[PDB]
Design a protein around this ligand. Structure first.
Ligand code: CLA
Ligand code: CLA
Ligand code: CLA
Ligand code: CLA
Ligand code: CLA
Ligand code: CLA
Ligand SMILES: CCCCCCCCCCCCCCCC(=O)OC[C@H](COP(=O)(O)OC[C@@H](O)CO)OC(=O)CCCCCCCCCCCCCCC
Ligand SMILES: CC(=O)O[C@H]1CC(C)(C)C(=C=C/C(C)=C/C=C/C(C)=C/C=C/C=C(C)/C=C/C=C(/C)C(=O)C[C@@]23O[C@]2(C)C[C@@H](O)CC3(C)C)[C@](C)(O)C1
Ligand code: KC1
Ligand code: KC1
Ligand SMILES: CC1=C(/C=C/C(C)=C/C=C/C(C)=C/C=C/C=C(C)/C=C/C=C(C)/C=C/C2=C(C)CCCC2(C)C)C(C)(C)CCC1
Lengths: 137, 169, 188, 163, 75, 213
């Protein structure tokens, strides 16, 4: 009858409850992603972000980079991934240096964002090195 | 309602009696399907009774056509596959008779007062007037109809395994 | 009240026996049309014009197939008048185009007289005032008989002129020798 | 009992259709598992029919445009690395539907969570829910009858109308 | 024939045919609220709304004419 | 789950007289001449206005009873088939004389049996003229069904005023109903009789000539 209602029963907030924003598929997927899952240390949050993101990011670098058709094609795609991860970790470092000023495990604080970007850098270089193993042998 | 008496013991099950014989329990699981079940039992019963007479009578006498003879078809068991133009005319006129019962099948519950299996078909008037032996006349149709349901499976496989005449070997 | 011609049907309400050939024969209810510039006035003017055109067409065929074409048009020589038209068009096409534009001026004036005669009430349908001998001056019972005789001969000639077109365009012979062909074919 | 608050699927010509009495006496918990089974069988079989009918005559491109004219032999030449992918990929959704199931206002086939917007009290939403389960029930038996005529009778196409 | 047959779709003085207003008000679903209700009153009271549709169609048509005249040359 | 249409079609108190296990149809009252309550598929109880085939329901609000439409269609099927079975046999010489028209298009050397007369005269053109002549009568007599559907006419079904010899001029209503029953009974038999002749000659066994077996 009506699959679009105002969000939070509030007709004047700038948001709608559609089956993209408020479906049970969306509510159950988003609450279990490591950005929003309840029982997670901020080191473990970023570690799951890094393991997801460092794994696929070796993909475009090995198959499309300048050393495509070489015998060092995989280690060139791995080194380009680590260089991209260090750029992204620098972006996380300068974000937390400006946004947060001086309860733990709450992600949007200064002490926890240093845990969050540390876990991202370990997980992203770890899963880029893991895909280095699975693509070679 | 009328078919649940006995004593008539169940063979290969010496403890069970046939009085209120319902081990799966279709009467309590779905009681609204019970007038559909009685209509289906009588239609299975009346078709199997003519199937028993129809399986042993063409063993001796044949209809005077010369595509139904013993030289044409000695066995009754392959007459279904040997006379296809004879089967469509049985299937066609039964299909007409069955299509005129769809508004009776569509009102088998509490729609109108037709009892299941009662097609108001008594031209010779053999239904008794007193009610207490009408039920045993109904019980005689069910017991003879249930027996012919068992028997036509034994008649056909008794002739499919051992190709022989009437009794069997 | 029932129709005279179709006594199982009710009488059509706009037909009341005032017109000449009125016996209530409108089963499709076409006299009740009042929308796309068409009403009972337009259909009666169309009936009367179809009557008079077809009446002249029948004797216009029977004049040439009996006594030949007119002098100046002796180039026809065909009893089939659907084919004899194309021999007059082949040789003297200007007189046919003279008549067809003279009809065009007459018919466009008659189309104005029909729609102005319908909006006003001073013109009967199919009436042009062409009574030069003056049959309409006296004996209104004998004048209504002439109004009915025009309609009765005109409704008959409508079938005859449509037939002589169609059995001239399909047999290529002519009307009177289509008639002799049918007489010898179906004699018993 | 359970059928009084679960009126989806109760459509003409039948009423509540249960000759064998499998719903009689059973709890609402196991009856909700039967609706979860009926909808999941009906939704896989509706997608199985559209998977069968496209690959039988039409648009079997690609897997390099080869491998497929008949749907049952086409389940052989593809690698099993592509099979357990499909097995793990559906099991990711079967895992996510468990999280949708472990929620208070969950209805036994509502993976989308349409009970947030409409309930079974408006007739147009019940009528469209019945259209899914009727076409699911029809595509269940019509997938089995067309699997079995390609397993045994050899033909994978339209044995009723033409080809 | 396809154009003459299509010119007998809409209701006029003889009862048969479709009302465009009743076509539009019937086409509404659970995502779109009232649906196409009120679009008949827009397109019979706003000349600008009709020109919005007719220019977007005649411009799209002229673009279709360009592709179809080079590829299937008609003259 | 909705109220079933079964209840609005049957009487549910009375049984059909011809088929005793079925309930009586709501429109079959025994007033019509051939009425013995025979409607096992309940086609008289169909709530559609069947005069929509002639003039659509969108033209104006009208409605003919289904039993009026069915009897008008039964009587037209009766009277066509009585003439057609007689016309098939008379042009085949079943009554002694092979009745043919005086034209040689219709002679027995041109058209040997009545089996071959349809396709021979669609090609010649006699059947196209019959379709004009029949269609003229059907446009002029079929429009009374619209008049009945509007509630304007009290005409009975199949009840033109065609009694040229006046067999029913001063007769009572039970002898008119007897005479209307003999029309219906001979018509229903001739409909099955035309079904026999048109099918038995169409088999590959043959016998296009009388007695068509
Ligand atoms: C924007 C258009 C475009 C594209 C598609 C490419 C593509 C490419 N460039 Mg080129 N290039 C471009 C513009 C582009 N270039 C421009 C504007 C310049 C400056 C003039 C260059 C200068 C340049 C140089 C000098 C070189 C290239 C090279 C390359 C190749 C590898 C690059 C790489 O490894 O990135 C890595 C890619 C990523 C890290 C991410 C890709 C984006 C991902 C896939 C998006 C995924 C989103 C996902 C689908 C959505 C979510 C899904 C789900 C979760 C919901 C690749 C073919 C290299 C080469 O050797 O060519 C063969 C190379 O040496 N480029
Ligand atoms: C198939 C035809 C048929 C039908 C529709 C019925 C229906 C009925 N019977 Mg009857 N019955 C039958 C055949 C049938 N029977 C036969 C052949 C016999 C002799 C063995 C009996 C002996 C019998 C007795 C003694 C009694 C009944 C009773 C009943 C009524 C009880 C309700 C019920 O349980 O439904 C039954 C539902 C079905 C029959 C359909 C289910 C079919 C199953 C699923 C298939 C398997 C059947 C069988 C085991 C096949 C074995 C072959 C296999 C191993 C290869 C119901 C009207 C009772 C009664 O009349 O109370 C008023 C009663 O007391 N029946
Ligand atoms: C439907 C009427 C009609 C038509 C279309 C024709 C057509 C023809 N006739 Mg025929 N004819 C007709 C009636 C008709 N005739 C009548 C009623 C007679 C007397 C019985 C004849 C006797 C006749 C003879 C003897 C011959 C023809 C010939 C011809 C052909 C050449 C003549 C020509 O083109 O003149 C050109 C047209 C004109 C000179 C003017 C036409 C009349 C004008 C438009 C006035 C009409 C007034 C109207 C009748 C009433 C008033 C209307 C309004 C005020 C209400 C031509 C095909 C000749 C032929 O070639 O045969 C093969 C020939 O020899 N006709
Ligand atoms: C039916 C319509 C009709 C048509 C189309 C014609 C057409 C013609 N006539 Mg004819 N004519 C007609 C009726 C017709 N006439 C009638 C009804 C008569 C009295 C019977 C005549 C008596 C007549 C004579 C005496 C002559 C013509 C002549 C002519 C031709 C020249 C016109 C003329 O005389 O200019 C100047 C022209 C082809 C002339 C002609 O060429 O004859 C061969 C000519 O001498 N006509
Ligand atoms: C105006 C009326 C009319 C008339 C008289 C004719 C006449 C004819 N047309 Mg034409 N035709 C007409 C209008 C007419 N048509 C129309 C409106 C069209 C369509 C536009 C056609 C289209 C057309 C075509 C395409 C053809 C004809 C043909 C014919 C001829 C065929 C013979 C026939 O069937 O006669 C009609 C037959 C009768 C009326 C039967 C007579 C019935 C008798 C009198 C009844 C008496 C019986 C009695 C009571 C019983 C007792 C006696 C018993 C004891 C012995 C005939 C000359 C054909 C032709 O040209 O042949 C060469 C032909 O091919 N017509
Ligand atoms: C269902 C009725 C019916 C039909 C469809 C036919 C059809 C045919 N007849 Mg047959 N015929 C019939 C009954 C019928 N007949 C009857 C009852 C007799 C008297 C015994 C005949 C005597 C007969 C003979 C002698 C011959 C035919 C022939 C033919 C064939 C060609 C006739 C033709 O086209 O000329 C056109 C016919 C006419 C114009 C006659 C008028 C028809 C009217 C307009 C029909 C409607 C009037 C109706 C009787 C009453 C109206 C009721 C209404 C007002 C409510 C054609 C296949 C011929 C043939 O080819 O044989 C092989 C042939 O020689 N018929
Ligand atoms: C394509 C989508 C599709 O057609 O869905 C159809 C859906 C509207 O469906 P309804 O059944 O509401 O449509 C009824 C009327 O809109 C059509 O007459 O559209 C939307 O959900 C809104 C647009 C989504 C746009 C997302 C981008
Ligand atoms: C408490 C409990 O459980 O105890 C049990 C114990 C007990 C006693 C065992 C019971 C039982 C189970 C029973 C009685 C099961 C019996 C089942 C039965 C009697 C099943 C045959 C049906 C007839 C047929 C199929 C006829 C076909 C007819 C024909 C003509 C054909 O064969 C087809 C054919 O001509 C064609 C068309 C095509 C050609 O190819 C050729 C052939 C010839 C093939 C109870 C009562 O349930 C209770
Ligand atoms: C509801 C959808 C449905 C349709 C529309 C349908 C139709 C046909 N079936 Mg199928 N059928 C099922 C469902 C359907 N069947 C199911 C659920 C099963 C159990 C798995 C099943 C089993 C078999 C077997 C063993 C055979 C079979 C056949 C036919 C053939 C009969 C025409 C005839 O000959 O009268 C027509 C096309 C025979 C055949 O010849 O297949 C080409 C055959 O041997 N069926
Ligand atoms: C009742 C619903 C219905 C379904 C569910 C269905 C399904 C399929 N049809 Mg069938 N079909 C009709 C109805 C249905 N078809 C109708 C009304 C007609 C006209 C009388 C018709 C005719 C043909 C012809 C000529 C062909 C055909 C095929 C297929 C095949 C592949 C999809 C496709 O391309 O249509 C799938 C199984 C082709 C084929 O069998 O390839 C091996 C083929 O050549 N169909
Ligand atoms: C499901 C789905 C989807 C999605 C997809 C995607 C997006 C995917 C992704 C995925 C991914 C993205 C994956 C990942 C993976 C990863 C991993 C698996 C990793 C691991 C790692 C490791 C294991 C490492 C380790 C280490 C370290 C840490 C350090 C030391 C060394 C080493 C190496 C040992 C879509 C949308 C289509 C829809 C449908 C369904």
């Amino acid at each position: 009858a009506n699959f679009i209602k105002p969000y939070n029963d509030d007709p004047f907030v700038g948001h709608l409850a559609t089956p993209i924003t408020s479906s049970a598929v969306t509510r159950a997927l988003l609450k279990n992603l490591p950005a929003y899952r309840f029982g997670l240390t901020p080191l473990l949050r970023g570690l799951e972000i890094g393991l997801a993101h460092g794994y696929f990011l070796i993909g475009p670098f090995v198959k499309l980079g300048p050393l495509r058709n070489s015998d060092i094609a995989l280690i060139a795609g791995f080194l380009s991934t680590i260089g991209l991860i260090l750029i992204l970790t620098l972006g996380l470092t300068i974000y937390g240096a400006a946004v947060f000023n001086s309860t733990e495990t709450t992600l949007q604080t200064r002490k926890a964002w240093d845990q969050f970007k540390g876990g991202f850098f370990v997980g992203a270089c770890g899963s880029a090195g893991f895909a280095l193993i699975c693509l070679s042998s | 309602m009328v078919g649940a008496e006995g004593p008539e013991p169940i063979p290969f099950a010496p403890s069970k009696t046939s009085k209120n014989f319902d081990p799966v329990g279709f009467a309590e699981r779905s009681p609204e399907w019970l007038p559909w079940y009685r209509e289906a039992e009588l239609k299975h019963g009346r078709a199997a009774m003519l199937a028993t007479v129809g399986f042993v009578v063409p063993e001796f006498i044949r209809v005077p056509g010369e595509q139904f003879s013993f030289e044409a078809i000695p066995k009754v068991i392959d007459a279904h596959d040997a006379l296809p133009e004879s089967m469509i005319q049985i299937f066609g006129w039964i299909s007409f008779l069955e299509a005129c019962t769809f508004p009776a099948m569509a009102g088998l519950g509490g729609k109108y007062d037709r009892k299941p299996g009662d097609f108001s078909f008594d031209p010779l008037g053999l239904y008794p007037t007193d009610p207490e032996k009408q039920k045993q006349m109904q019980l005689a149709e069910l017991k003879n109809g249930r027996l012919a349901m068992i028997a036509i499976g034994g008649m056909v496989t008794g002739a499919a395994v051992t190709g022989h005449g009437f009794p069997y070997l | 009240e029932k129709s005279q011609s179709l006594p199982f049907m009710n009488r059509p309400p706009l037909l009341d026996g005032s017109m000449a050939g009125d016996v209530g024969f409108d089963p499709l209810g076409l006299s009740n049309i009042d929308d796309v510039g068409i009403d009972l006035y337009w259909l009666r003017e169309a009936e009367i014009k179809h009557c008079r055109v077809a009446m002249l067409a029948v004797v216009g065929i029977l004049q040439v197939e009996i006594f030949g074409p007119a002098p100046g048009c002796e180039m026809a020589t065909d009893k089939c008048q659907m084919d004899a038209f194309w021999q007059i068009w082949g040789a003297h096409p200007q007189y046919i185009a003279f008549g067809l534009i003279m009809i065009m001026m007459i018919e466009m004036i008659s189309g104005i007289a029909t729609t102005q005669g319908r909006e006003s009430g001073e013109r009967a349908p199919g009436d042009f005032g062409l009574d030069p001998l003056g049959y309409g001056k006296g004996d209104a019972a004998g004048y209504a008989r002439l109004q009915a005789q025009e309609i009765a001969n005109g409704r008959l000639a409508m079938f005859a002129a449509a037939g002589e077109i169609m059995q001239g365009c399909t047999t290529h012979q002519g009307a009177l020798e289509n008639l002799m062909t049918a007489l010898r074919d179906n004699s018993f | 009992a359970w059928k009084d608050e679960n009126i989806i699927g109760i459509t003409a010509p039948m009423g509540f259709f249960d000759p064998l009495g499998l719903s009689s006496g059973k709890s609402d918990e196991v009856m909700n598992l039967y609706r979860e089974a009926e909808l999941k069988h009906g939704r896989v079989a509706m997608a199985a029919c559209l998977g069968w009918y496209i690959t039988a005559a039409g648009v079997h491109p690609a897997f390099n445009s080869a491998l497929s004219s008949d749907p049952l032999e086409a389940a052989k030449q593809l690698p099993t690395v592509g099979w357990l992918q499909f097995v793990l990929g559906c099991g990711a959704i079967e895992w996510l539907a468990q999280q949708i199931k472990a929620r208070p206002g969950y209805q036994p086939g509502d993976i989308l969570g349409a009970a947030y917007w409409v309930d079974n009290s408006d007739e147009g939403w019940v009528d469209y829910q019945n259209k899914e389960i009727n076409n699911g029930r029809l595509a269940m038996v019509a997938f089995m009858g067309i699997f079995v005529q390609d397993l045994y009778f050899g033909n994978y196409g339209d044995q009723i109308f033409r080809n | 024939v396809l154009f003459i047959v299509a010119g007998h779709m809409y209701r006029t003085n003889w009862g048969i045919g479709h009302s465009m207003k009743e076509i539009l008000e019937a086409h509404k679903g659970p995502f779109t609220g009232e649906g196409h209700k009120g679009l008949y009153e827009i397109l019979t009271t706003s000349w600008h709304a009709q020109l919005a549709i007719n220019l977007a169609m005649m411009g799209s048509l002229s673009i279709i004419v360009a592709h179809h005249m080079y590829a299937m040359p008609p003259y | 789950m909705p109220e079933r249409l079964w209840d609005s079609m049957v009487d549910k108190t009375e049984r059909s007289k011809a088929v005793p296990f079925l309930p009586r149809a709501v429109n079959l009252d025994g007033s019509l001449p051939g009425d013995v309550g025979f409607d096992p598929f309940y086609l008289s109880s169909i709530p559609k206005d069947f005069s929509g085939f002639i003039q659509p329901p969108q033209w104006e609000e009208k409605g003919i009873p289904t039993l009026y439409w069915m009897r008008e269609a039964e009587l037209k099927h009766c009277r066509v088939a009585m003439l057609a079975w007689f016309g098939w046999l008379a042009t085949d010489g079943a009554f002694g004389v092979t009745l043919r028209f005086p034209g040689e298009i219709y002679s027995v050397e041109n058209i040997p049996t009545a089996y071959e007369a349809h396709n021979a005269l669609v090609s010649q053109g006699s059947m196209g003229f019959l379709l004009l002549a029949v269609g003229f009568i059907e446009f002029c007599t079929g429009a009374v069904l619209v008049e009945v559907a509007k509630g304007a006419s009290d005409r009975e079904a199949g009840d033109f005023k065609l009694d040229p010899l006046s067999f029913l001029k001063g007769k009572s209503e039970e002898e008119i109903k007897r005479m209307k029953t003999r029309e219906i009974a001979n018509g229903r038999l001739a409909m099955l009789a035309f079904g026999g002749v048109a099918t038995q000659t169409a088999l590959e066994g043959g016998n296009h000539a009388f007695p068509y077996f």
